[PDB]
Amino acid sequence: YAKSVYWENTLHTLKQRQLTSYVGSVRPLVTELDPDAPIRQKMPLDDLDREDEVRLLKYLFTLIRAGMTEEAQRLCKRCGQAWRAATLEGWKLYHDPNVNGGTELEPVEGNPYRRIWKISCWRMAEDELFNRYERAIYAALSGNLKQLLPVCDTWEDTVWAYFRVMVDSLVEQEIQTSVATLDETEELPREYLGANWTLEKVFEELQATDKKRVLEENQEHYHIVQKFLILGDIDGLMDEFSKWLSKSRNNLPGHLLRFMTHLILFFRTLGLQTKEEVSIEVLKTYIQL
Amino acid sequence: NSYKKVDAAELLRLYLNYDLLEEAVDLVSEYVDAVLGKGHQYFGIEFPLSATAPMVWLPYSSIDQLLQALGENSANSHNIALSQKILDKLEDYQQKVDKATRDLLYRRTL
Amino acid sequence: VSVINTVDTSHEDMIHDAQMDYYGTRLATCSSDRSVKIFDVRNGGQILIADLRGHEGPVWQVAWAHPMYGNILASCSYDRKVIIWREENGTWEKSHEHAGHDSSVNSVCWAPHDYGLILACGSSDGAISLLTYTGEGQWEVKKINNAHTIGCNAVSWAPAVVPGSLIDHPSGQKPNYIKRFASGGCDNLIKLWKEEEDGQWKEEQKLEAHSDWVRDVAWAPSIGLPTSTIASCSQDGRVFIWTCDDASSNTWSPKLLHKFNDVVWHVSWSITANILAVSGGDNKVTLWKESVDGQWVCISD
Amino acid sequence: RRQLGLVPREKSVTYGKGKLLMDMALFMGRSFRVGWGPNWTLANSGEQLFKVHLEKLSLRQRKPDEDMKLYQTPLELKLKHSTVHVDELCPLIVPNLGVAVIHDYADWVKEASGDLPEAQIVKHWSLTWTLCEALWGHLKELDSQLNEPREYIQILERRRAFSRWLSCTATPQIEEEVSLTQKNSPVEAVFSYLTGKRISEACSLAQQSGDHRLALLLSQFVGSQSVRELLTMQLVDWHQLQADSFIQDERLRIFALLAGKPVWQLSEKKQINVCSQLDWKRSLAIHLWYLLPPTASISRALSMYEEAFQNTSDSDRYACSPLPSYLEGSGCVIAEEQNSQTPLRDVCFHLLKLYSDRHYDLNQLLEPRSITADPLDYRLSWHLWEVLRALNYTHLSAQCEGVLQASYAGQLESEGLWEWAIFVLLHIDNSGIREKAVRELLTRHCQLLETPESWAKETFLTQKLRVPAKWIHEAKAVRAHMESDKHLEALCLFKAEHWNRCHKLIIRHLASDAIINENYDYLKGFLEDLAPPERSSLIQDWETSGLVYLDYIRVIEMLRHIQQVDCSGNDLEQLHIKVTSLCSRIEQIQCYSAKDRLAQSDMAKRVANLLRVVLSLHHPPDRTSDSTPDPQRVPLRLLAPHIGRLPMPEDYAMDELRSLTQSYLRELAVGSL
Lengths: 289, 110, 301, 673
What we know:
This is part of a larger assembly, with chains A, B, C and D.
Chain A: H1 8-17, H2 37-40, H3 49-64, H4 69-78, H5 82-87, H6 114-126, H7 132-139, H8 145-148, H9 155-178, H10 190-193, H11 199-208, H12 212-217, H13 221-231, H14 234-248, H15 254-269, H16 276-287
Chain B: H1 8-17, H2 21-35, H3 60-71, H4 77-105
Chain D: H1 24-27, E1 35-37, E2 41-44, E3 52-56, H2 64-67, H3 69-78, E4 82-85, E5 92-95, H4 101-112, H5 119-135, H6 151-168, H7 171-181, H8 186-194, H9 199-209, H10 212-219, H11 225-240, H12 249-258, E6 263-265, E7 271-273, H13 280-289, H14 298-309, H15 347-356, H16 363-366, H17 379-388, H18 398-414, H19 418-425, H20 431-445, H21 452-463, H22 470-482, H23 486-494, H24 499-509, H25 511-516, H26 520-530, H27 533-536, H28 546-562, H29 569-586, H30 594-618, H31 636-643, H32 650-669
Antiparallel strand pairs in D: 1-2, 2-3, 4-5, 6-7
């Protein structure tokens, strides 16, 4: 709805209330126009800007959920949110290359207060006054799995939430072991710094979830293959193929039997071992396809 | 003249509960004329009867009971005159409620 | 018919409404004496629970919430207010006060619990308000300005299972609850209202058959019935039933039930939808039944 | 004063002024509203039905020991003759396609037809179900045939059975008519017997009266058409010769009946109508026995009877109209009602029409006005439809089925049979309406007091009707919110399998008082059924709360056991590991009240003493003194690193320090010996 200014309808409504001809109803609204005014005053926008902010925040999350964080910055820049376009940079790892004595001059990269910025982004994830998608945007850049899972509404989104935070947490553990910072007096949360991770664990937590969709998708044939290829476990994968053939042989999807055959041929072409009695019975089932 | 600005109907309920029928007749004689703007400020009323205002109200339940409470003593000419003093004034009011209603309907149909 | 109880409701002045809870264990009553009075009525007893004074005018309707949200009551007044009241630990206090109307608020009605805790209110300015509980004591307020011309008199919600409106849904998805309500006014109109995909509220359909000011309107509960049905009453003494025989057609038929000797004030559906109660201007109630021949027969005269 | 009444409306100063919109006390100051409640209850404020009544819509004046059997016995018959299907989220109940139900009902009403005060309604239901026995039920004649019984034999046995029913519907009135007429006119008594097919008794009375050539004539009339034609000539001759006018009109009425003449025209211009003064059943019986051959159908007798009571252009009416038994004898000449385009008739006549025409109306057949003097009594209406649906009649409207099922389910809610209102609503084919109607009704009627009556209805609904028990406890949780009990809310929410609602209530309202009273074995009953990995991996905050309270209880249980049995070092290693796992976790409990903070500190004082008893069983003495193991011999070196984590107040922690300095000074006093 907004097409020449950020929060254009609330800005128009304030400029209309400043006119001594305002015989309108006084809907409670923000009186300030910085992007924190709704949370500092605990007051609403008018409902056109309050649709556009909710539309925009889902598109920004959908782009970051696709690695398109640079497009999420360009969408913030395109929608007049020059401020949110800058917050979407603050996660970048710090570097001054010139410390090693350059022959010419090179740029300084990242954020030398990335730790304090992650603490601040975690604080933006945990107040219920922020939108689920803005909380998830800052969570996916600060390790807050606990505020990210409230938006991840597919199996792929739920696997992604665990793996995205597992990398971010292991990166923080190597950095906070190797980079001796001084006089920093605030902690990143011990639920995230004290996080033990394994691949097997992530694929038990994905079976502990209340999200019934994920519990039904975590039983379909390719999502099962995706678990086992991520684990590297070919031994349990051939017992899945046995657990399928022994129940379903004549009824299996013909393209899944083409895939099961060609994955066994790929493993054999790499010299990787398989449960050859089951490899034989997949091949016999595919000749019988 | 404090309590009239809070509820003249809870005062009229009290005056009927305590048989103060002449104070009730002159309280109704003020209240109807306060709604007709001659003293609205003494009855808490923001706006007297106009096709430019909120809609008004009167305790007709208590007024019907006052007219009966007078008429129960119909052997007295004073009770008859006090009843007429209400009735004659309530049409002098209700002809203006009719006009204010017609003046308002002609401002919600244009 | 047989009497159970004859409650001595301690009101000094005219009663405008009398409503029980979802279980018939409690009774709320409102009046010209600026009070709402709540009673226990179990087993034919009477005990006063509260004298809820705290409107400043005559109170024109009461409405109990569904017990899924706890012991909540709403009431509306001549003073432009709608007050929400709640019992917590066994005492009653005010849990909201909405004064956002430009004249007397003549009716209130809660949504089906399936839509969330939402109240609707109709006003003598011509508007309607909707109040949605957002959480932790807070309320969103939507105001449908000019919803009726001359004034708004009554509001009643559509039941959250619209008949037929499930056939296209494959097993394992949620119902898309199409929130709707009906409202009557001094424009002689009944109007049907819907929430759209932006969360705004819209005039969906008009229902035009009374020759005078509509006093009240009530939607029938969709228990067993495959049709969608409404009752409404008028200042010319009519009552119409209105059927909608196909929920995809959105098309309504007016069926005259009766025309009385004076005004009809209110219309009230049984909790099994099969019977209508009708409040007449000669201070009576009459009771009405649909036959298997689809004809509306009196059961009180 | 005293307060006066509300002044009656014709003396109100507001009278007629409801349009004066600018004064709210004229516009609404004499309006009122009314509120329905469950069981067909109403709240009111009018002139007769300040004050409010509570009222009920109810049928008759309460003999519960009698009234309820006229619902419950038919319902415990119908629940044998439907199947229950469980392939949806809400089960469906469907009729058993067949005939048997007609006999279950017909022989039940034969028993019920005696002493019961609803005797007029029960006897009309007896006519309806013995008519279903006559028109679709068989068990006796056709059922003797070890071959598929031909349509012709069915049409004939249907007429043979109905040619009993039209006598059984006539006998008590004939037996009163004869008791009166016999001693004044034997000719009217003989005619009355003949209108019920009692030809043997008519012949017997004619030999008793001295009318022997009338008795002889009557004795032969059961077959030979020649006698019907011989009396047809004899009447034509007596009329043409003007000899008729010297014979009794009452006797000419018998001769006309026998001759198969419904009206006879005499030489006086008198007419003798044979059906005059009779009821509608004996009128139809004259068409079935005297105006037709042995070889005609029921449908031809019914159509010749309908040809006898309507207006034509060419004949006077000679039969009466078919009317419900509660309108018979009334004298009501229905004056052609100028709205009611369908004239009312008996349910027995509508069933005879549906037997004569498979596409005849079901709406006027199932409407209670055809059955009873009450527009609220759907008892027979629903049980007729749930036999016609079993007989594969399918041309009722879904609005009319919906109005029948909702009206009879409301009749069952109102007189208190709400579990049978569920049985009716479970015959709703539409799943989305069926689930909501059953859950909405359960949400009203399920009580927190699990009484013998609630338990009988809950076990009936779950064990007969297969109603998912989750919704009984969903309803009890919605009731527990209204009646504030958060133990019965937690328990009924737990009986609906959403773990986080039970757990985050237990940890705030049930855990602290249960620990404070050492009621461990009760708190355990909630926690070990929450504990399984397929439930507990869904629970927020479990490992720092519910698992801490539960590991504390299971540590107490494993010591309660070791204090009674010769257990192994492997089990005491486990106990020391379980205690060491618990100290820096009682450390972590979310204690919202002073009770929770006291439960946490007494759990901590108990754990500090458990740790000593576990360690003195790891440090037993050498085998030179037969003494019990000393908890004060425990090394300080194994106690202090774990006690220095327990959330204990000074009044608990400085006592722990006196116990620790006692073992430290013993580590010195047995270091210098």
